[model samples]
Target: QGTILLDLAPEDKEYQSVEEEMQSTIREHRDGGNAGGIFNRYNVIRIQKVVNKKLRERFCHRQKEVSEENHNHHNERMLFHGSPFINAIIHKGFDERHAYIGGMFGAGIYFAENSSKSNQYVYGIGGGTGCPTHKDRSCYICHRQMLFCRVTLGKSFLQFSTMKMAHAPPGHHSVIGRPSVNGLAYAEYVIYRGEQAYPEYLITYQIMKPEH
Candidate 1:
């Protein structure tokens, strides 16, 4: 397999690192308001594949185009994309051209800065197992999955409202959608090009009950 998803054992150092980060990050927005449930991590898969050199080169090219003053950081971020094609993504990576049409932010690849928001697209699409899907669907169990995407957002022109954009609006590398109300909405990011991102990890999890 050109791209592979390797299981991470509970004792694996990388697993620990990923889990710790996930545990803390989920805390930033959960069990309150829109995100009413707490997440219980189940399985984590590490991506082991040959990097696309050309894609990276293209990303670097975009980075180089950025103004030197803002060049110190390429705005590289780890965002969440709730997609169901786990096997296809692991084998072929994220293909923006064919990666589910979405213009919610742009006619491009969209990612959620908050994992809870991404959860909406999953739950049912987590896997074919089809046992626990969605909240309160059955036994309060849901097996949904989201991808930890590594994105190089060279420049993000933030917008409070939505836009029907398909390009980066020149001089910008990506677009950011901010929520309308404070502490009430989820922030989203959209990249026009697929080469700018790749799925780094696949996390399968479920929403835990109120008690634990």
Candidate 2:
């Protein structure tokens, strides 16, 4: 109404192809995002908080430390031996202390060098972070590009989509995974551990009959 084409016919030559229009729309949406001033005032404050706390200084995305060549098999990726304290904080449960504290163990671990010619990827286990989807939705996992892998996991009732691999800008396919033995296997193991380790967490008290 004010600047550009206001009223254009469907069959107009000046209009873009449907695919091109959609791509342009997506690009605009991604670039504009929720960070646009009006909607993201709180986010602006949080950014300030992070800066003041020196959180950004502490925060580091160490891609080299968590490399793909290191983890090329499923089982090898499941040795999660970090801090139980940290893991507990991440995964949600109604009773936070019981859920995480009771399940005190290493966050994750890794084993064996990746084989040169193998389909094995990082086995996400022990639960720091990774994509957690069901058997389906593999294609949606790669919604962005070829560089993305559809990593998923099922733990008790909670199905999560957590891990996202974004290559260096001017992005290209590169080795990426949890710094571990086998990436995929590790993911499965963590799901298993979560399900087995915290059965009570999954159980709903409302569904259970009264115990008089």
Candidate 3:
């Protein structure tokens, strides 16, 4: 019997230290009772599929413009107009729509600037002319490095995570070249509008689901 599955173990203290920091950051969110905290800490505000579709279109259109502008530059970054959380959810909505339309490829949003900065995020889509031959392009290499800020609508210190997507890549395609981790979970997001200070809606995934 033979298998090519490879697992990575870090030998560097710096790597371990960063992992520890990520864990601590997650804890801070859960314990702080803000965004990623206990459900009891906040109430849910459901959204209409029509409204979600509009938001999704807005996100994709803006992303299309951003990608076009940055296409020629290596590592060029841009500052989007909405809260990072709203952008993340909008990004997810796009992916879901592509799947429903019988496509395999999807896009992702990642952190462009420092983690503590506001509205400093970038968008990248994955999937190209052909499927990927390497596994790295399918795993952590594909995960979006998002910056979760404490800013929310009419509230402050809200918590969230740099959503860990499975095998979504960076390009402009509709076919998935690599498989992804299969799992199901719920996410609660406090949506913001016009200004980052304006709380728009409390969106929940899977339950108040996006347009299929």
Candidate 4:
């Protein structure tokens, strides 16, 4: 007959020590409660959180609508809802080439600086998503397209800036505009239009500092 040894004895320090060590490190079998340390952050960064499909849909709709007539799909700037860990800070250059480069650097530096400090850092590089899709695309402000629309909700504000360089000539002069259409005040108009549909996810700009 076999009997269960209910009590191994409290003085069994050897057995207790081994059990404690194993419990601390094991995830499934034990609590695994140890300060994971910096590597925890590195490990966390590796655990990529794929953007949800629905979110992409919401953002894509806006991008497609905004660039429908004049601009190309590839060269349009769109946001994938508020949850996207991406921050876009843009300053248009007088010339296409200069504006392209400047926007990249501005966004890149912001991310790099934030990445080092925060446990997670994303898009901390200088890059642009949509460039000029058309052969002769002008700035968003003075686009010369009769049909343009911008919408604002609540206190949401959007601004555009232009930079001109002497060394390399930029194609055209710069102008400023809001997510603003010529005659229509986007903020008030969108709300009043009963039939107009809002994106599943809201589109608003974070004008202050870039968010991580």
Candidate 5:
């Protein structure tokens, strides 16, 4: 729920961008995401978690707030956010407090431009020390999902290392965290509020077709 809410409507034209962007972003990874799995996506859904009007209103509320004070004109980036408590998210929108990914950057909600970066999460393998959603981590060929959200980074800070910020400092709206050598590869975006992002499309890349 960052800047703008998408108009949930119609066919191929509507989802074309989803495929294009996902293909580009996921495929563009430096390693080509060549780590064992073939990563195939079958469905892309426009997840309208709540009422359009109210959602639109809230997003615009933050939209104006950011663009006016923000020099970047609402650095709106379609980012990835994965979770096990999906129903919970759909029901209440993206909640930063509920996530378990060790926050690495305070209680902020983290997002990734790369699907694989977010993939580690769909499988519940991200909480740094232990899995956040569930303890059972090994799933041979599992059904996994992640949402592409519109995240605001207007006047964002480039974080090279972890900083436990309660919120974006001063006039900054968010933080973009970068890698530290062999430490972390993919980049991640962080925001403090629920309204700072909104899920636009849900990509379903079930690693393998069901056995049943």
Candidate 6:
């Protein structure tokens, strides 16, 4: 028979408090309610720990496809369909020397900063004052965090195309010709394609800022 007056020890109470808070945080994010709450790293780690085998296998399969590619195409980027959190982890796990595995401008992983920039440019950033919605209007959410990235094209030239093709795949109708500007335009084109794939998550493109 269980006692009716059982009391929790101090340590037990502290653990209970932490468990309750963790669950509440998870619920908040799932419901799209919390905008900027600090979730413990352990929370993310716990979620990853429990992920089933089939899902891991699926991501690994996708990773293989990413690995096989030479990324020689002018617009070398690929789309990934999965939990943004897990993908980010896998992207970070690899060493920088493995270009096929999340190295600088790897085709396998989405660049967060690039994704952020595309979202900012298309949806409008700085309150969209500089760029406004022309047709159907949509609400844009701004994330305060930023990432830094650098570019080296190995002597590849860049060109600009119509804004209408912003979401189009790179090297498509979006890239009208190969004769204009520096790598900046090409960078924008790549970001545009990535944003189209994952607008909210910013998982596919990194929100990168160039610094000197």
Candidate number achieving the greatest lDDT relative to the actual structure:
5
Model 3: lDDT of residue 194: 20
Model 4 ranges off by over 4 Å: 1-45, 74-212
**Best first by lDDT, ranked:** 5, 1, 6, 3, 4, 2
Which of 3 and 5 is ahead in lDDT? 5
Provide the lDDT at 174 for model 3.
12
TM, every model? 0.71, 0.15, 0.20, 0.20, 0.73, 0.23
Query: Candidate 2, residues 1-212: lDDT per residue as tens digits?
Result: 11111333335442223212222221111222211111111100000000111211111111222233224222112121122232232233112223222211222211112111110121122221322342221112311110011111211121133332221112121222333233332222232122112111010001111134
lDDT of 1 by residue, 116-190 (tens): 566544533322233343344222354556777778787788877677777877777888887554465667888
Q: How many clashing residue pairs are found in candidate 2?
A: 30
lDDT of 3 by residue, 133-155 (tens): 32221121222233222221222
Which candidate number would show the highest TM-score if scored against the true structure? 5
Taking the tens digit of each residue's C-alpha lDDT, what string does model 4 give over 45-139? 01112223443344356445434532443132111111113211111101122222343112111111111111111111111221134321111
Task: Compare candidates 1 and 4 on lDDT and give the better one.
Answer: 1
**Candidates' C-alpha lDDT:** 0.61, 0.19, 0.25, 0.21, 0.63, 0.26
Q: Residue by residue across 18-114, what tens digits does model 6's lDDT show?
A: 3343333221123121222222221211111122344334434433443344253223233212221333333333222222322122232223222
Error of 1 at 56 (Å): 6.7
Q: Could you tell me the C-alpha RMSD of candidate 1 in Å?
A: 4.7
70, model 6: CA deviation in Å?
A: 4.0
Model 2 lDDT, residue 38, Cα: 11
For each predicted model, how many residue pairs clash, with residues at least 3 apart or on different chains?
0, 30, 9, 1, 3, 10
Task: Count residue pairs with overlapping backbones in model 1.
Answer: 0
